[model samples]
Target: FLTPAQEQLHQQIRPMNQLYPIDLLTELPPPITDLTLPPPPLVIPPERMLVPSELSNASPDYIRSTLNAVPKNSSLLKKSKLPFGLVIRPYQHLYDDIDPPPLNEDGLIVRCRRCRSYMNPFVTFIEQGRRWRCNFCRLANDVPMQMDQSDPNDPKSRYDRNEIKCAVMEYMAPKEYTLRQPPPATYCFLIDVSQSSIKSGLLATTINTLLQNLDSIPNHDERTRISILCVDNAIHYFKIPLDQINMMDIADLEEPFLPRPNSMVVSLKACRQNIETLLTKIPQIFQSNLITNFALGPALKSAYHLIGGVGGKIIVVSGTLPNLGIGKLQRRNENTSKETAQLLSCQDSFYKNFTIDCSKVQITVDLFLASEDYMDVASLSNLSRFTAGQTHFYPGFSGKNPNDIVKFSTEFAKHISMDFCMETVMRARGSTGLRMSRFYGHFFNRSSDLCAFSTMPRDQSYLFEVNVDESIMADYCYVQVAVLLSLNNSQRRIRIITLAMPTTESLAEVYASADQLAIASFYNSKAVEKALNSSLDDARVLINKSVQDILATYKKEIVVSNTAGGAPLRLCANLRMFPLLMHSLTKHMAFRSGIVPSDHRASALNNLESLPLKYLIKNIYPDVYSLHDMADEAGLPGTIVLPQPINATSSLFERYGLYLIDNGNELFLWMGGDAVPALVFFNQRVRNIINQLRNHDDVITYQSLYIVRAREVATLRLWASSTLVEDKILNNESYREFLQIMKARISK
Candidate 1:
């Protein structure tokens, strides 16, 4: 059925997804020349390339669609059987070349009165530029005084206005969108001063990291404020103006209340020394205390009441379980698969409801759990899940483990210093024919389109499952995402990104234009939804069916008559890795059955749902590259020249090879016993590469590096082996068998 070259190439096929290193010593090994692989699809659609570079749609890094060319009608989409969706990373750090949205100088923010969609590039200027018609609802509206002066025919005049040229822009929000003046950036730390935290050195490390990064925290307006509240059976509120440490205690853990409310949240600029002094003395303050109990809920409650009026972020750092007070949790028995579902589910509704309340008042609560014992993370994580906060879990954390401390320190510093927004809300709108049926990511959505985020960090990304509501008659379909937020300066603004996708009635065009990465992300979101709402088994089954359905539909609708000898399984270049990704996802810790602890699984599931596409794919299918080989420019200071990535299969591994595998949160340096590289140079280069990888532009969380010997039979080696998704592991089918089975299904 297949040519020898096709079969040979097919057998060697595996997941090889990675971005090209910007500083290339030379051109990447010439594009795949193998007979089995097809030509790569253009990331920027051909239609978009026709427009001027300055006026092109938003970069694919910010907004990407599963199908670049969407089907014209629901029936065509159904026939094609391709999932249509968008993987959006809205708050990415824009480079100097990429222009930010300009504010309407005249304070005139125009929109379609009928559909309420903002003015975008797709909108047409009609009536001799006097009125503009909405691209979504086709409603004609008067052009505002600011827009009317520009002659539509003059490219310089029209495109010079950023609103018309840039697909992504920002607008200065009017008073109607403001509520009580956007609050300043305020951060309140709820640290657990219990025995566990102190003994494990988590408390000291956290305090030290905060002290180092406190000034680095965004406070452009000089109104940035900070508050400290410690919990250990009692809440210790560090009274402001620190002149000395005036600690006020509230013993009643039940029904927490604010103690010295006005003085607790103090301006950072006003009390920089006081803040540093308190942070420096905190670890010493509880250095000899024997407090073992943690009143987490009460501490959070007290912090809430203290900062609720000023609305900001609450960072909870604890190593001990919340053993006393409201929302206290009992440790689960670490036995039996039957207990897994229960362990994964929340034990209390208090945290969930409390988070909802925090979101309403523009308060974000981030959780950092550093413990060697069971902390009921499944329940405690609710605080971050409901609000636009993060849950950083370090299992088996100990002061003895320098790696753990370093990991926590880097991540904590990044969290406190990253570019983030406060009092934020986001909405994704599309043309009349498109509907956002379901939203995914970490945020509270109370209304149909708006997603509320008390603290919107730049690290997160959101996904939207789009439904074809009606046939699109226009040449292009449009999608716009607007994020309304208040920066550290307390100014209300809206960041808008508009995406224009070509429409096609041909099923071939649909399959040809597919984006496997975005498709994988979309399915990952669905599987995460299923795992939480139903069971892990169901999620696994859904992934299996997804591969089967996509291939079967492609065979039935797109493939021509098959040859009698054998039928080769076929997929477009963009979708060639679908089956591999799905296979890898099935074995992912989040959905994989057997032996994975409930707490770890819960954390992995949360990551799957919220991580951006770039990291999520790597986490699912890691990037493995041989580090023994050298390029002159590799591991340089300005830019590191990355070796071309290889698939995560042992079949391609050489006996003496040294490889580095990066899977978002962790990096593994794999060395064979017989490896004979120059130790001095290799070690220096590897360290430099590791540092670059950890500080890469797209990296949000700090990665811990683990060295694994090829001959060693330790848990670390086995853990590193699990990242080899192409190999048959955990009783899952190998990539070849998966394709063979797909061929049989297609023939049927």
Candidate 2:
């Protein structure tokens, strides 16, 4: 069995995209794509190569799958019965691209006549001719002679240079293919000033974040509009007219109506000074209305109408339940409801139903909850959840709270300034006769085959469960994603990304290209869905079945084949991560079924549903390290240093060991109480680490250290005084229980 380090090194050296040698076995196994694993990264046949490094490990495979190789029919599919799917982060801010094809205008971007699948590297030039065959539908069409130019987007016009070259490329559609762009995006803030918001210091923080970050309210032209609306026992609107701020009050919450809908929105540059004055008065205005109460549903309706025709972003900051108006929901999560399998999901469809209207108008609501009370995130999340917006939770948040303020500040900054697109419609099509059965991420399905988003956050991803129509006929398969969106109220734009994967029939090759990382992400989404809809145990069963199927099926390849020091804990090296990732699911707080806050569980489930693949894996299996052990090789200084990773079992814990547990969300530095005096040696070093983190950009740690990372790091600095409340996580008896649960799971 290989150690984790050896295992990683082995994968990099293993030849990928090659045909498997499984036929040599007396019992040739069927394709391992059906086994539990990430669909192999798309392997393009070498003959069709454009950029060799494009599909290489160093570049991002934006489109990922659970099954890299597909068999001929359901007959073959049923034999393996692998629960498979695809997850795509189309607009993910990539460090590198598949080297996109430049904008090709002049005429219709070439595509298949039948399937409309766009031209990609996988398409073949046929009949010694100007006609090309589509990789997806297998149909051949005559190329538009006029549009077919020397080099398309390539300035040099090389003969091998076709218009569509890279696996992922963009196209600028002719004006006829675009929708009349919506006007400049409008922005709205619906603040919940209920007493719960006041006491938690969330009220102060919300205002402060907006005040400090107003310059980022919108990343658009001066013509974009912005508004601020408040919800308490009554409704309040801050109107910026001419050069002064005016506040409007309406007591009736049940009969919702926008008093001055037109007056609600003010042009950003035109009302600059008044907007500042209005933001300054936000907290003060609420404090005097005094003992506050919130009615979210009705207030939301007003804000919705306020943004009317041109839908934009609605930032809803709530600290309490909507117990007072239309669409009001009663407190539902049971306090003693220990059954985690079926943690209450959205109890009402009211928000969901209303979200359809929001999506129709291209409005995306971002739900922000900061109170300790039970706010049904399942229901409240609908405002943002369905319309391609975001849902954020800041339990016990406050301006005075050590971590909440920074989190809120960073989030709002991204919320206000990240890529903004309106009336967005996104679609994905595949070559090799692949069609998606369903898409499982945040978005509204315009049709069974189409996915649409009202607000497309630049970093969000989408997942798809694909079905094969027939056996692939080409040497390579292709996937294309097209996004039709209005960019900053400018011209309508169509962004296209086309990808190609190599095809193979070898059973061994399937496992050879198996993407264990991508496979885990698919299961993570499914696990969150099952855990929330059923029980954590139900999700656990799915995981168990996955492990059992892979182990039982691959028994021959690894038959007591490679044993560790004493145990038969071995599997094919390509899939070594399968068991670790599956077991890691049960160890995570989100799926642990261990003691944790219910709201926290809800928050985790919501997060797992959409977190990036790497983040999902990290949250599942945190990287635990021993601070005392330094690496043999060293690089940067003042930069964050990561120690060697250790397994999460109890054996790693010595009576006096000092460890840093960075779980992405909860970064913990634990000194065994027994290690107290011993840890005193590195106290200053750890303290400086905390100060270094405080001054750094929150983004510095995000993807690598996203989640509650900073607060997690700060808790460690307070370790000397034992003032860190998070210290309880390092408890002795319960700590044993945590490991014991994992021990049994792994042992069996």
Candidate 3:
């Protein structure tokens, strides 16, 4: 990926004021397709790849910077006109040969007294570890007597081998930093058993799935408890027994209260027989009812009071909007939202306050909306969003819809069967001059420096705004993230990730190392945030303004082309992809007005901020493939195919070709023109697979020899997070305009 000289140049702070250059003509290909001009690759080729393969190089997944090369100071950052920041995910997934760093349980993990940076790979030991200089603040600290005995040859030495090998490490915290006991897993299920819930049949699927995975739910001690409750126009609380599998109705809609604080919660081990009876019989008791009205707010309130103090996860399965209680929200308004500050405001302050309380008490809420109509997700989502939980929305889903049911069952099963950490606190630390600006994604910040999570799922991401408070004088800026969390094993662990980036004074150097993928991500985030808080047009303006500002900044600062500088405007590598991507973004379905419903708009916002980086990018710019001429020589291994990429345009496609487009939201298998000859070419095998693919229960395996020709690689999966729309739908009348609009953009 690099020349020898370029590789050597990458080793340290890039040399300043060099005329580092790339030939535009050589970098871009002539427009061979219908595009009047080829859009520079949307992803500017990175100077170096970000993640280290567990195969050789080892780096923690906890922290990732957008730039491999950092600006030397505020001056060069302003000069290059590129985005600067990083994302931190503490307790991130670790793969083989990348084991968790060994714990430093010698009572204290070493730290610098002045800057308080944790002891890690970045710090330089002085006088053979008698003292150390902090990489962050450059302060020298006396090595503690506890850490002084650092000889690795001795059996009783405290020198951690992992500290020298891996960039990430974890340590057991003292009693002051964590829960008094190895905490038991406390899970409360708050389900909507109203008519909408039963009609959707998800109510039963959720409970039945929990029962199927009942044994795996308890990963801790006697504190492991499960309580069941349901809500309708009347709030119902169930006692753990055959004696009271029936609901004890507290029909108080406005003033919801619990009969007893802890009576509803039951120990899984202590009341095993009683719980089994209740789980076996609750659906029978409620499934037969056709009650239409529901009091969601009161039910939510009562649900919280039950286990709010001890800190647990409350999984809420909602079928419809809450229009009857304290936290109830109004029906969806079919009107335009103007450019105003109210777009980010909640429907009511009640839920926000409740979410705050949940964070304080270590109680997280997960929402599963399985409804055929609007479920007020824009407002209802706060409980999950603010408390660091997930909101899984299944539109038009119910028990009767087989497609939705199967999807629901599969997703529900995965949720309960996965690992969840509790009472999680994430703290990000960086060089002294850098300060986290404002957090833009999900979860409520306990303060500017800390964010709280009631329960942390294994797969989750967060974004933060980073700024330079003072000049960055050092040759490099380092970031380290530490996660203080309570584990399922009844212990507290601090997971840390550390990464250091090179700094440069040259604008060309910044352009050479710019990470387009990371920039596009944060750019999209700001646009989405603006769209939600202001207006769609406002969002568009903001995005265009940023692109303009970056290009103009380069012209003025580096090229000396602005009237103020009076020099020639020079287009650089980072500027090449801006126009095409910005135009495409304007046309994306997520931001376009009139067509998208508010609920879907809010849902997209939820997804943008939450999904992993790979999915997030794919969701923005879909992946397209051409399978018209796959040869046997390329070979096939099982069900996967690494297809060649191509333009999704008429110039590239012929009537005889097969194509697949994955747009994160859905998996579309499209054919060109009549597409008959290609089908007949592989007729028997492919036709059979196509038939099986249409069946609701038959999940397509694109890896199979018939449907695909080679082993698949990359992040997009056929029917994982997206639904596989049929191949026949490629010719649908509704797609005509969509196809044309896409052509218009690609051509532009």
Q: lDDT score, residue 214, model 1?
A: 82
Best by TM-score, which number?
1
TM-score for each model? 0.91, 0.82, 0.80
What RMSD, rounded to one decimal, does every model reach?
Answer: 11.5, 10.6, 10.9
Better of 2 and 3 by lDDT: 2
Overall local distance difference test of candidate 2? 0.62
What's the lDDT of the predicted structure labeled candidate 1? 0.77
Question: For candidate 2, lDDT tens digit of each residue in 156-230?
Answer: 242233344555545556676665655686788888887878877777778887777778655455677888887
Q: CA lDDT of each candidate?
A: 0.77, 0.62, 0.61
In candidate 3 the C-alpha lDDT for residue 277 amounts to 74
Leading candidate by lDDT? 1
- Mark the regions of model 2 whose C-alpha exceeds 4 Å error after superposition: 1-42, 50-61, 94-108, 127-129, 145-163, 333-343, 556-570, 631-641, 654-657, 674-748
Q: Which stretches of candidate 3 lie over 4 Å from their true place?
A: 1-61, 91-107, 145-160, 215-223, 241-246, 261-263, 269-274, 335-345, 555-582, 631-641, 648-651, 677-748
TM-score of 1: 0.91
TM-score of 3: 0.80
Question: What is the C-alpha lDDT profile of model 1 across 488-546, one tens digit per residue?
Answer: 77788888888877777878777877787788888899998887767777888888888
Better of 1 and 3 by lDDT: 1
